[PDB]
Amino acid sequence: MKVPGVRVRALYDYTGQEADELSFKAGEELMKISEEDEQGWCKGRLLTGHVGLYPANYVEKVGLAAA
């Protein structure tokens, strides 16, 4: 266990930027699996096992309080 899925929720309903990106719904939950890029792009997996890039700038965690 080194990089578990990071649970995030989208603040709006968007569908990638090209055909290689993931599609999420407003309030849907996704699990990031890779790191963020210079364009705020993050690679992850949806709960359905779908893989691709998702706009990190359009989502936030839904884990615990900020502290």
């Binding site: 709006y12 930027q17 090209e18 290689d20 890029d37 364009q39 705020g40 890039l53 706009p55």
Partner: peptide, 15 residues
């Protein structure tokens, strides 16, 4: 990066 993202974000920031 792979491709030029939808970025910058749309809203929910400045409050």
């Amino acid at each position: 990066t792979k491709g030029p993202a939808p970025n910058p974000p749309p809203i929910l920031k400045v409050w």
